[model samples]
Target: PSPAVVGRSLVNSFKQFVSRHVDATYRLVLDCVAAVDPLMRLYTFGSTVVYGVHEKGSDVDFVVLNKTDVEDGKGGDAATQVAKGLQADILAKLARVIRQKHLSWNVEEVRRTRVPVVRVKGGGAVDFDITAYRRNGVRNSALLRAYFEQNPPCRWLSMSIKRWSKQTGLNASVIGGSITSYGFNLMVVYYLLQRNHLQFVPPSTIDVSRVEPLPPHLPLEEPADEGLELGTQVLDFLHFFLHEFDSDKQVISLNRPGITTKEELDWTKSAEDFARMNGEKVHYQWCIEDPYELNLNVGRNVTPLKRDFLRRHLEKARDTALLTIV
Candidate 1:
């Protein structure tokens, strides 16, 4: 087939797949809500809304808000107790319903942990996070928000790092896990924000790659002249830029050798290790498990097969139609 035909076919297929999945998910939720009365309100958030970055490996994130908060008369402790019970009941019910339908889902109560979350299993071994929100708390709170808002450089920085990692032929999944170009950039931005700076210097101009080695037992304080030279800054920025646009994965860091002796495994390494130990590939499935522990599924995996299959088929339909046109 011609390149144009193939490309057109792929596009159509992708669109159809997306439409089907969206409809399916919407119907499933509506049915579940009708059957389950305790579920007061539900809202979708996270990557699904932020960037069109979800694949078959992506998981749906639902914010489940209980209506009890509207009528509860308790102050603090009583409120907490009631909230916990409500969350548990909701999770139990969700699990039962999903199981009855023979749908693959992992459900858990979110309020029980420091970061409240409930996980539901999905297709292709994927899972979704059903986070229970309090009547009054910051909604859709992820560390990424603060970082992106405060330091624009961090956003670009993460994009650049991920691009570079890809171009360098690093495992895309590994790089995705490692530091999450966005999450790492967010941390960097957070640090800079702590330093009283509202803006971030671009990573290319900042020269993060050449921070220099410290002598053993050296103190953690920064030197008086810690800024990077102009040449180093420019080089770092360009390097980051080239990689950001590249498609190949770069084996940057896996937490095996460790980015630094003092630093523990980066997030990517941690995720990879955890996934491997659990006999799963790291994507974005949510479950109730310790970050350090390998067992249990936490989030959904939005891979291409699970999320884009229908779209691909639709694209093939377009291709077939066009072929007949010729």
Candidate 2:
């Protein structure tokens, strides 16, 4: 979204923390990206932008598109070639402008990964992450936006869990922590998808064959909660997560409907789709299928220590929740 176009609607936050809203933040970062490349357009997705993790302990995820293909009279083949090599140029442009603007944001070192990004410090201590030219990021954002609008309970659970994840220090993928906020949001949504016996609409069931205004999932029955309250759902989620959680034994599918695990989808091959880090042997034990980018594994960087920390919290949380079950 352009800087001018933000602030149209305010998101619903639990505590309703002070300013640091996506709209205002978007304006700040959008101006930077636009200044760098007039052709570059900024788009936001993930939890804060989607509003679940809004209010606090969150960061804005910005995806910039400098697509040459969309330009009028541009040759399609030329556009395709431009996309392949656009990241370096756009990254440099953003880098230059960011420094020039006196924004004083601390940016992390950039390198090749699943999606090349310019990680910028948000309000404080390096919060926001800006990625360039990723359509999958854009697509996933739309998916979550639909959820945030239609599902109020989802907002509660997602925000609560995200806060919980942050409080426990399991939400920072930036500092070698296990689980991105996006991953945590998906963990909550995935539980909702499975509640009442896997009641959900798969992307396959609906046709997205056309461009723009992606087709909505055929009317999904609100997840069967067995008349459980929000607190109870969290308890159950903890129980299921801690006891039944198996990142390796199971896969999380956001786009592929009716598939129980990544293995069922035959996506268990090694190093084929996972983004490597410093040439280490990455397992990507947590398999999450990116609905838009089917080949992208969002959890690739989560190392064993990170995964264990998350799992440890689930165990402790489940134990605590059980005490309140009565």
Candidate 3:
């Protein structure tokens, strides 16, 4: 198969896998949520909603809206806390119900994490992170989907890069202080936007949708004019990062077009100095501005070791990807 055909097949495979697993998990959550809180609503966020960038065993995340948060249009009280009110009660209550009914599945009520979520792991290792009142996540997922919709080929490139990152041991944000799958996915979106393949979409313009069970054969209705070769585009992505992108001088901003400088954003402090001043453990070394949340840096977890490791692997992967073209 040619590179474009190979890229098409890779994308289709991911769509089918995501639809199948995400459907099953959503159904399970719907059934369980009915038992836990009949008035509650579930909204899927992350790779499951955006489509085609997720690999095997990726977590299917959900943000639950309680009766009050839904009615008021004001999500949960806080980003991370399940100590009081309906949000805490609902998550804790849902955890108990899942434990009782789904004996085979592993269920844990994680309260101390950044976001208080009830993490459920199925037999196949495809997990679900169920949280309460996370509207930002839903918004960001829609924002990503809109960008992918604008440029269909970008999704294929995203899937390829994401798969490579996982295989190269550079995708573990929790354990290795490296870029997360979300971070890499954002990197792809940022890269494509810079290349003029995708344009900056307003957050207000993009609206979130509810997740429904998709069919086995999802449609790939790309524009007729989109005739770029996948092999070339893939190499361009690598070269863009290897040479064009300088994490030190420039910031990756998806909010607008053109380069955003580190000096302009005032994100040019050493980790120690920044921490000492702000009393926050955030690194601006590998600055990646969040598309929706302007203040948040998506690459905050990336340590110097992990950043160097990521750059080295990109060089190695680019060399390997080049051989296939030759």
Candidate 4:
């Protein structure tokens, strides 16, 4: 089959898979709400809620808000605890219901149901995560909505990278297919948002890299070897990876000087930094954990190269078959 045809078929399959999961989850949620009576209110969040269609291995995410604490002024953590307890109860009831209905769904409750890992049935081996959010305390629906609206670059970059990987035949590997693509796109989004001119709230996967001399621009030839001392390379990579989560920088609007100022850096630096940070060691650990960790890392590092790669690829893929926003 042609690449375009294959891409379309894959997308169609993804849509159907996501639809089934969502329908099953929706039913389970309604049942749980009914079972628990008036204890908690459930809703949806993350990509599943925003985009409607999930990718190949997407999970159903539901937010449970405690009724009494919906308006409480306590920090988001307290509300998170309440949500966790509620999730436990809901999972148990949901499992029972699924079994009673003779559904083939697998259900399990995760102990630490945070950003990267959400637990549900099927032996805790599924790819998608479902997280719970507190009602009144830290749930910022307005901010969330605004963030999604302003960040078109994320979707654009993601699709582009996925397409590039497919073209290169790297998409066949488990590591390359989902996790690497996810990290690469995320890194690109972080840099773009860091541009002084672009004021946008990045997701939780961003990291911080200490300001090193921006890397030199290179054509997309055989991957260049800088021949830096191994120790230096290792340190540089670590610093680059660790900074994506740094919070010391001031957060600004998506249309400001921050994004612009950062864009002046050399593009090669961005690619090198990303490659270093996202190499095997980091990629494996990241993929096995919460997706939000990827977001948190981007917040720390917003270099020019990262921004350029994202913008460039997203533009290229805008007319291609490997991208989807909905």
lDDT of residue 88 for candidate 2: 55
lDDT of candidate 1 over 278-312, digit per residue (tens) = 23465321111111212322222323242243233
lDDT for each residue of candidate 3 in 1-326, tens digit (9 for 90 to 100): 34454444444434554435567777789888889778777877777666634446578888786555445442223533333344567788888888888888888887554456888986777688888765667667767777887876567677667777777777763456367777887888888888888878866554333323221223444423332355557777777888899988888777667888778777777433564212347777777877665466777766677778878877876656522322
Candidate 1, superposed: residue stretches over 4 Å from native = 1-23, 52-56, 67-82, 103-116, 135-138, 141-326
Whole-model lDDT, model 2: 0.56
The CA lDDT at 13 in model 2 is: 23
Q: Indicate which candidate wins on lDDT.
A: 3
Q: Please state every model's RMSD to the true fold in angstroms.
A: 16.8, 9.0, 4.7, 14.6
Ranking by TM-score: 3, 2, 4, 1
Model 2 lDDT tens row, 80-169: 345546765677678778767855767663764445577777446436777766555545555565555566556655655776676666
Q: Model 4, 1-326: lDDT tens per residue?
A: 23334344334433433222555555566565556455655555443433333444444455555554444423334324455566566556655654466354454555532332244555433332334434311222222333334553234233434445555333423432332343443333444445321355532212111111111111111111221221122222223334442222222122222322222222223433453332221211221111222222322233333334434443433333333322
> Residue 82 lDDT in model 2?
59
Candidate 2, poorest ten consecutive residues by summed lDDT: 2-11
- How far out, in Å, is residue 69 in model 1? 6.3
Sum up the clashes in candidate 3.
Answer: 0
The number of the candidate with the highest TM-score is 3
lDDT of each: 0.36, 0.56, 0.67, 0.37
Residue 60, candidate 3: how far off, in angstroms?
Answer: 1.4
